[PDB]
Amino acid sequence: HFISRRVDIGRITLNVREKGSGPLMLFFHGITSNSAVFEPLMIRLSDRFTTIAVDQRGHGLSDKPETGYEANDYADDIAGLIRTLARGHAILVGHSLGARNSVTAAAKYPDLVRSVVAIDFTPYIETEALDALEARVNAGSQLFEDIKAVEAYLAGRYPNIPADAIRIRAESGYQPVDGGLRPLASSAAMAQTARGLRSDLVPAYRDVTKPVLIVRGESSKLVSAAALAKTSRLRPDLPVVVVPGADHYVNEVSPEITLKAITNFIDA
Amino acid sequence: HFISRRVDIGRITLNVREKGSGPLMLFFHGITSNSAVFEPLMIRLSDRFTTIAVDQRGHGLSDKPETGYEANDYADDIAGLIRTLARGHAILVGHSLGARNSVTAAAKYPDLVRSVVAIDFTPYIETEALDALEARVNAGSQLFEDIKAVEAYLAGRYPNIPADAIRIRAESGYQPVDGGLRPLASSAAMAQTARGLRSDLVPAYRDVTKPVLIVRGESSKLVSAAALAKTSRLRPDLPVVVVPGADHYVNEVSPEITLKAITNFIDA
Ligand SMILES: [Cl-]
Ligand SMILES: [Cl-]
């Protein structure tokens, strides 16, 4: 149902998945992931919005520059893409890396973005949590024998993610290479992106003038309850949603509640 | 520049304050209060919304029937007001009694209401808290020498409410009588309304299908943090806003954060 195409936005070329019609709504995945993880959620909003998932730089079928993996880099990519699509301001739905990127974009390009749904990535994340993300970020950079081996690997790295979601990641983020399957994501891009995630995100949340819904997973190991509390104290006006039973991977682990939270937000 | 008028909705006649143009946005006050407390907030949304604050049954300059002060009665009034106004579904922004009435209405009349901003009134409010409220409301029915005495009394009863807001309550809630001033609100209505606020509100929050923004004051004595925590597990999808340095009287104590929270919600 979704058509894939690489879009030249000038500064770089990105791969995207499109479907539906109506106001623009862009989806941005987390580190090492890719645009496909959002198809289940998009089909649900396609009749009312033009849903487009974006493989961000260094990931999926998008360009993989030698460098430039900081917040600003990803943020400028978003502005470029919104301008290139020229379909009006966009609602940004981002998960982790995507969430950090969307809020940075919204704060720097007020006019290009209508609102943001920041799923599991706020300022104040503790060093230990980022140490963990950084240590296993390229644990996937290896040669898998077949798709079965990819799923085994994924199911083990993301124990709470549903088999269906595991299969989607397995089929979309790994391609047949000499001798087996390998990640589409560039290892150098990941390493640089991971340490870029340590930068101060306070200015971005403090200065964003557009609506931002903060979504946290109850048992998320990336965004702690203490981190969300400080964020809310920084911006008490930003609506908050805490998803029960969900860890860092909110949209994949709790698809229904995630959907309802988004529709409650944009339809109000 | 507000225009006040008594609107006959059939089942009863209510007084309302109107200003601005655009999508309909209705405001509902707390028990013993009246529509005037919202003027400062409405002034801020008049430019793009047709803002209308309502003196609910038994309050202000509205009809004060002898009986009928349960949630259903207050909720059916809201339905009639939206039908009589004939201007499309309305956004419901209610405080305490008003919030309780608004969610109730949303659950019962989904097509008449676009969304709801429920300020400080969730289910699970503990008994002792409802007892204290009831005690204060009934003790409010007394004679005051003059407006100065009224202002002193209200200030002592609501220590955190800013003087300008206290004055508004003093100038709008009373009537000249022999001996000085007395509340406009019907005492019988208040007693009955206070009692009705004890009814189970889980049903309404559980079945409401339209967007609802839950707003709590960090130090509210009516809506405890536990009550909010329980409300969020009942409906984890409903966005939440907790206002630091604000008690039960959120919109009057923290007007800026309140306005901002409202716009982040409806403009998403
Ligand atoms: Cl990430
Ligand atoms: Cl009340």
Side-chain angles (χ1 to χ4, degrees), chain B residues 199-242:
Chain B
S199 62
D200 174 40
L201 196 50
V202 169
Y205 263 84
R206 181 228 296 139
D207 315 316
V208 57
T209 68
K210 314 310 296 290
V212 177
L213 177 69
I214 304 174
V215 182
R216 180 179 100 89
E218 173 190 59
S219 57
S220 170
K221 295 198 282 188
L222 185 62
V223 171
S224 69
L228 175 60
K230 297 171 184 176
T231 299
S232 280
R233 301 205 70 110
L234 169 67
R235 288 297 302 265
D237 60 291
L238 303 181
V240 177
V241 166
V242 174

Short mmCIF file of all heavy atoms in Angstrom, two decimals, chain B residues 199-242:
data_model
loop_
_atom_site.label_atom_id
_atom_site.label_comp_id
_atom_site.label_asym_id
_atom_site.label_seq_id
_atom_site.Cartn_x
_atom_site.Cartn_y
_atom_site.Cartn_z
N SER B 199 -20.61 11.56 43.72
CA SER B 199 -20.97 10.45 42.84
C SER B 199 -19.77 9.88 42.10
O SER B 199 -18.80 10.59 41.81
CB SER B 199 -22.05 10.89 41.85
OG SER B 199 -21.60 11.94 41.01
N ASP B 200 -19.84 8.60 41.79
CA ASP B 200 -18.77 7.91 41.08
C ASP B 200 -18.56 8.51 39.68
O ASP B 200 -19.49 8.58 38.88
CB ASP B 200 -19.10 6.42 40.99
CG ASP B 200 -18.12 5.65 40.15
OD1 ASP B 200 -16.91 5.93 40.23
OD2 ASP B 200 -18.56 4.74 39.41
N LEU B 201 -17.33 8.94 39.40
CA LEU B 201 -17.03 9.55 38.11
C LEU B 201 -16.24 8.65 37.16
O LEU B 201 -15.94 9.05 36.03
CB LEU B 201 -16.29 10.87 38.33
CG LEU B 201 -16.18 11.87 37.18
CD1 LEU B 201 -17.54 12.14 36.55
CD2 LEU B 201 -15.58 13.15 37.72
N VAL B 202 -15.91 7.44 37.60
CA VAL B 202 -15.17 6.50 36.77
C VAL B 202 -15.89 6.24 35.44
O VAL B 202 -15.29 6.31 34.38
CB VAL B 202 -14.96 5.14 37.50
CG1 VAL B 202 -14.43 4.09 36.53
CG2 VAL B 202 -13.97 5.31 38.65
N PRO B 203 -17.21 5.95 35.50
CA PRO B 203 -17.99 5.68 34.28
C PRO B 203 -17.79 6.71 33.17
O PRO B 203 -17.56 6.37 32.00
CB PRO B 203 -19.43 5.66 34.80
CG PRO B 203 -19.27 5.15 36.20
CD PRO B 203 -18.07 5.90 36.69
N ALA B 204 -17.88 7.99 33.54
CA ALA B 204 -17.72 9.06 32.57
C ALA B 204 -16.32 9.14 31.97
O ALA B 204 -16.17 9.37 30.77
CB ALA B 204 -18.10 10.38 33.21
N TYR B 205 -15.29 8.96 32.79
CA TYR B 205 -13.92 9.04 32.27
C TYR B 205 -13.59 7.81 31.45
O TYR B 205 -12.83 7.89 30.48
CB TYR B 205 -12.90 9.17 33.41
CG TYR B 205 -12.47 10.60 33.68
CD1 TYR B 205 -13.23 11.44 34.50
CD2 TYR B 205 -11.29 11.11 33.15
CE1 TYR B 205 -12.82 12.74 34.78
CE2 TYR B 205 -10.87 12.40 33.42
CZ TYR B 205 -11.63 13.21 34.24
OH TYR B 205 -11.20 14.49 34.53
N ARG B 206 -14.17 6.68 31.84
CA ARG B 206 -13.95 5.41 31.16
C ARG B 206 -14.60 5.34 29.78
O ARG B 206 -14.03 4.78 28.85
CB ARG B 206 -14.48 4.26 32.02
CG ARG B 206 -14.27 2.86 31.43
CD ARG B 206 -15.56 2.05 31.51
NE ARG B 206 -16.01 1.78 32.88
CZ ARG B 206 -17.28 1.84 33.28
NH1 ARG B 206 -18.25 2.15 32.43
NH2 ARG B 206 -17.59 1.57 34.54
N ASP B 207 -15.80 5.91 29.64
CA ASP B 207 -16.51 5.84 28.37
C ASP B 207 -16.41 7.06 27.47
O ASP B 207 -16.88 7.03 26.34
CB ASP B 207 -17.98 5.53 28.63
CG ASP B 207 -18.17 4.44 29.65
OD1 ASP B 207 -17.45 3.43 29.58
OD2 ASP B 207 -19.05 4.59 30.53
N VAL B 208 -15.81 8.13 27.95
CA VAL B 208 -15.70 9.31 27.12
C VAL B 208 -14.88 8.96 25.87
O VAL B 208 -13.80 8.36 25.97
CB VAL B 208 -15.06 10.48 27.91
CG1 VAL B 208 -13.70 10.07 28.45
CG2 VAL B 208 -14.97 11.72 27.02
N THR B 209 -15.40 9.33 24.70
CA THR B 209 -14.73 9.04 23.43
C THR B 209 -14.05 10.25 22.77
O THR B 209 -13.29 10.08 21.83
CB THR B 209 -15.72 8.44 22.40
OG1 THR B 209 -16.68 9.43 22.01
CG2 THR B 209 -16.44 7.24 22.99
N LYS B 210 -14.33 11.45 23.25
CA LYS B 210 -13.71 12.63 22.67
C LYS B 210 -12.45 13.00 23.47
O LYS B 210 -12.32 12.63 24.63
CB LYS B 210 -14.69 13.81 22.65
CG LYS B 210 -16.09 13.45 22.15
CD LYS B 210 -16.07 12.68 20.82
CE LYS B 210 -15.49 13.51 19.68
NZ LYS B 210 -16.36 14.64 19.26
N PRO B 211 -11.51 13.72 22.85
CA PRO B 211 -10.28 14.11 23.55
C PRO B 211 -10.52 14.82 24.88
O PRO B 211 -11.40 15.68 24.99
CB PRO B 211 -9.58 15.02 22.54
CG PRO B 211 -10.10 14.54 21.21
CD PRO B 211 -11.56 14.30 21.50
N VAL B 212 -9.74 14.46 25.90
CA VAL B 212 -9.83 15.08 27.21
C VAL B 212 -8.44 15.38 27.75
O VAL B 212 -7.58 14.49 27.82
CB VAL B 212 -10.56 14.18 28.24
CG1 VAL B 212 -10.56 14.87 29.60
CG2 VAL B 212 -12.00 13.92 27.81
N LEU B 213 -8.22 16.64 28.12
CA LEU B 213 -6.95 17.08 28.69
C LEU B 213 -7.15 17.19 30.20
O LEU B 213 -7.96 17.99 30.68
CB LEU B 213 -6.53 18.45 28.15
CG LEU B 213 -5.23 18.98 28.77
CD1 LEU B 213 -4.05 18.12 28.31
CD2 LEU B 213 -5.00 20.44 28.36
N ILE B 214 -6.42 16.37 30.95
CA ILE B 214 -6.53 16.38 32.40
C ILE B 214 -5.50 17.32 32.98
O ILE B 214 -4.30 17.14 32.76
CB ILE B 214 -6.31 14.99 32.98
CG1 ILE B 214 -7.29 14.00 32.34
CG2 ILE B 214 -6.48 15.02 34.47
CD1 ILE B 214 -7.06 12.56 32.74
N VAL B 215 -5.97 18.32 33.71
CA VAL B 215 -5.09 19.31 34.33
C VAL B 215 -5.20 19.29 35.86
O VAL B 215 -6.29 19.43 36.40
CB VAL B 215 -5.42 20.73 33.85
CG1 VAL B 215 -4.46 21.73 34.48
CG2 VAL B 215 -5.35 20.80 32.33
N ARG B 216 -4.08 19.11 36.53
CA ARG B 216 -4.07 19.11 37.98
C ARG B 216 -3.06 20.11 38.53
O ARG B 216 -2.00 20.32 37.94
CB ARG B 216 -3.72 17.72 38.55
CG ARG B 216 -3.70 17.68 40.09
CD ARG B 216 -3.37 16.30 40.66
NE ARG B 216 -1.98 16.19 41.08
CZ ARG B 216 -1.51 16.49 42.29
NH1 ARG B 216 -2.32 16.92 43.24
NH2 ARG B 216 -0.21 16.37 42.54
N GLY B 217 -3.41 20.74 39.64
CA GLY B 217 -2.49 21.66 40.29
C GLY B 217 -1.60 20.78 41.15
O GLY B 217 -2.10 19.89 41.83
N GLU B 218 -0.29 21.00 41.10
CA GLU B 218 0.66 20.18 41.87
C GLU B 218 0.32 20.08 43.36
O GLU B 218 0.56 19.04 43.98
CB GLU B 218 2.08 20.74 41.71
CG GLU B 218 3.15 20.09 42.59
CD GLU B 218 4.48 20.85 42.58
OE1 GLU B 218 4.49 22.06 42.95
OE2 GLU B 218 5.51 20.25 42.19
N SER B 219 -0.24 21.14 43.93
CA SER B 219 -0.59 21.12 45.34
C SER B 219 -2.09 21.24 45.59
O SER B 219 -2.53 21.78 46.61
CB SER B 219 0.17 22.24 46.08
OG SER B 219 -0.10 23.51 45.52
N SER B 220 -2.89 20.73 44.66
CA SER B 220 -4.33 20.76 44.81
C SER B 220 -4.75 19.88 45.98
O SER B 220 -4.27 18.76 46.13
CB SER B 220 -5.03 20.24 43.55
OG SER B 220 -6.41 20.06 43.80
N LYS B 221 -5.67 20.38 46.81
CA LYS B 221 -6.14 19.60 47.94
C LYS B 221 -7.38 18.79 47.58
O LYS B 221 -7.80 17.92 48.34
CB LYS B 221 -6.40 20.51 49.15
CG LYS B 221 -5.11 21.17 49.66
CD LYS B 221 -5.22 21.71 51.08
CE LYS B 221 -5.96 23.03 51.16
NZ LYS B 221 -5.85 23.59 52.54
N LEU B 222 -7.96 19.06 46.41
CA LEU B 222 -9.14 18.32 45.99
C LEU B 222 -8.74 17.09 45.19
O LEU B 222 -9.20 15.99 45.47
CB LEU B 222 -10.08 19.21 45.15
CG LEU B 222 -11.40 18.50 44.80
CD1 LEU B 222 -12.16 18.17 46.09
CD2 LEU B 222 -12.25 19.38 43.91
N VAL B 223 -7.89 17.28 44.18
CA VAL B 223 -7.41 16.17 43.36
C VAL B 223 -6.00 15.79 43.82
O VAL B 223 -5.03 16.49 43.52
CB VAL B 223 -7.34 16.52 41.86
CG1 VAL B 223 -6.64 15.40 41.10
CG2 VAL B 223 -8.76 16.73 41.29
N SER B 224 -5.91 14.68 44.55
CA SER B 224 -4.64 14.20 45.07
C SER B 224 -3.80 13.60 43.96
O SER B 224 -4.31 13.25 42.90
CB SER B 224 -4.87 13.14 46.14
OG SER B 224 -5.39 11.96 45.55
N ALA B 225 -2.50 13.47 44.21
CA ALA B 225 -1.61 12.87 43.23
C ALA B 225 -1.99 11.40 43.03
O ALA B 225 -1.82 10.84 41.95
CB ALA B 225 -0.16 13.00 43.70
N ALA B 226 -2.49 10.77 44.09
CA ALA B 226 -2.89 9.37 44.00
C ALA B 226 -4.09 9.25 43.08
O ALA B 226 -4.14 8.37 42.22
CB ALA B 226 -3.24 8.82 45.38
N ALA B 227 -5.06 10.15 43.27
CA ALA B 227 -6.27 10.15 42.46
C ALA B 227 -5.93 10.33 40.98
O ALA B 227 -6.54 9.71 40.11
CB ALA B 227 -7.22 11.27 42.93
N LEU B 228 -4.94 11.18 40.70
CA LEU B 228 -4.51 11.40 39.32
C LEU B 228 -3.84 10.14 38.78
O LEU B 228 -4.10 9.71 37.66
CB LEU B 228 -3.52 12.57 39.24
CG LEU B 228 -2.92 12.79 37.84
CD1 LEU B 228 -4.04 13.08 36.83
CD2 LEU B 228 -1.92 13.93 37.89
N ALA B 229 -2.96 9.56 39.59
CA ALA B 229 -2.25 8.34 39.21
C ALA B 229 -3.24 7.23 38.87
O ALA B 229 -3.02 6.47 37.93
CB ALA B 229 -1.32 7.88 40.35
N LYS B 230 -4.33 7.14 39.63
CA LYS B 230 -5.36 6.13 39.39
C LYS B 230 -6.17 6.48 38.15
O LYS B 230 -6.59 5.60 37.40
CB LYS B 230 -6.30 6.01 40.60
CG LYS B 230 -5.64 5.55 41.89
CD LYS B 230 -6.64 5.69 43.04
CE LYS B 230 -6.03 5.35 44.38
NZ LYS B 230 -7.00 5.60 45.48
N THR B 231 -6.40 7.77 37.93
CA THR B 231 -7.14 8.21 36.76
C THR B 231 -6.37 7.86 35.50
O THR B 231 -6.95 7.38 34.52
CB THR B 231 -7.37 9.72 36.80
OG1 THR B 231 -8.13 10.05 37.97
CG2 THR B 231 -8.13 10.19 35.56
N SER B 232 -5.06 8.10 35.53
CA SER B 232 -4.21 7.80 34.37
C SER B 232 -4.10 6.31 34.06
O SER B 232 -3.85 5.95 32.92
CB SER B 232 -2.82 8.41 34.54
OG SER B 232 -2.85 9.79 34.21
N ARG B 233 -4.27 5.45 35.05
CA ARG B 233 -4.20 4.02 34.76
C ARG B 233 -5.54 3.59 34.17
O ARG B 233 -5.61 2.61 33.43
CB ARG B 233 -3.83 3.22 36.02
CG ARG B 233 -2.48 3.66 36.59
CD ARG B 233 -1.79 2.59 37.41
NE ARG B 233 -1.32 1.50 36.58
CZ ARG B 233 -0.03 1.23 36.33
NH1 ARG B 233 0.92 1.98 36.86
NH2 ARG B 233 0.29 0.21 35.55
N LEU B 234 -6.59 4.34 34.48
CA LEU B 234 -7.93 4.06 33.94
C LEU B 234 -7.97 4.48 32.48
O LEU B 234 -8.55 3.80 31.62
CB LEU B 234 -8.99 4.85 34.71
CG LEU B 234 -10.41 4.87 34.12
CD1 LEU B 234 -11.02 3.48 34.18
CD2 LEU B 234 -11.27 5.86 34.90
N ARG B 235 -7.35 5.62 32.19
CA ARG B 235 -7.32 6.17 30.84
C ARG B 235 -5.93 6.72 30.53
O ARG B 235 -5.74 7.93 30.45
CB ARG B 235 -8.35 7.30 30.70
CG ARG B 235 -9.80 6.84 30.66
CD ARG B 235 -10.05 5.96 29.44
NE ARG B 235 -9.73 6.64 28.18
CZ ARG B 235 -10.61 7.28 27.41
NH1 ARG B 235 -11.89 7.35 27.76
NH2 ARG B 235 -10.21 7.88 26.29
N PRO B 236 -4.94 5.83 30.33
CA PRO B 236 -3.56 6.25 30.03
C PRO B 236 -3.39 7.05 28.74
O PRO B 236 -2.35 7.69 28.53
CB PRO B 236 -2.79 4.94 30.01
CG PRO B 236 -3.83 3.95 29.52
CD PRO B 236 -5.05 4.36 30.31
N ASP B 237 -4.40 7.02 27.88
CA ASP B 237 -4.33 7.73 26.61
C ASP B 237 -4.63 9.23 26.72
O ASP B 237 -4.20 10.03 25.88
CB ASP B 237 -5.29 7.09 25.62
CG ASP B 237 -6.72 7.14 26.11
OD1 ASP B 237 -7.03 6.44 27.09
OD2 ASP B 237 -7.51 7.89 25.52
N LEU B 238 -5.37 9.62 27.75
CA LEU B 238 -5.71 11.03 27.94
C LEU B 238 -4.48 11.83 28.38
O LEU B 238 -3.85 11.51 29.40
CB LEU B 238 -6.84 11.17 28.96
CG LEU B 238 -8.12 10.40 28.61
CD1 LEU B 238 -9.17 10.65 29.67
CD2 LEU B 238 -8.65 10.82 27.24
N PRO B 239 -4.11 12.86 27.61
CA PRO B 239 -2.95 13.68 27.95
C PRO B 239 -3.12 14.38 29.32
O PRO B 239 -4.23 14.78 29.70
CB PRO B 239 -2.86 14.66 26.78
CG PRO B 239 -4.29 14.79 26.33
CD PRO B 239 -4.78 13.37 26.40
N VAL B 240 -2.02 14.52 30.05
CA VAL B 240 -2.02 15.12 31.37
C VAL B 240 -1.10 16.32 31.51
O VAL B 240 0.00 16.34 30.95
CB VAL B 240 -1.58 14.08 32.43
CG1 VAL B 240 -1.52 14.73 33.80
CG2 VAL B 240 -2.54 12.90 32.44
N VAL B 241 -1.56 17.31 32.27
CA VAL B 241 -0.78 18.51 32.56
C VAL B 241 -0.85 18.76 34.07
O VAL B 241 -1.93 18.86 34.64
CB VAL B 241 -1.33 19.77 31.83
CG1 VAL B 241 -0.72 21.02 32.43
CG2 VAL B 241 -0.98 19.71 30.35
N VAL B 242 0.31 18.84 34.71
CA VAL B 242 0.39 19.10 36.14
C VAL B 242 1.05 20.46 36.31
O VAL B 242 2.19 20.65 35.89
CB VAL B 242 1.24 18.03 36.86
CG1 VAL B 242 1.41 18.41 38.32
CG2 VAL B 242 0.57 16.67 36.74
#
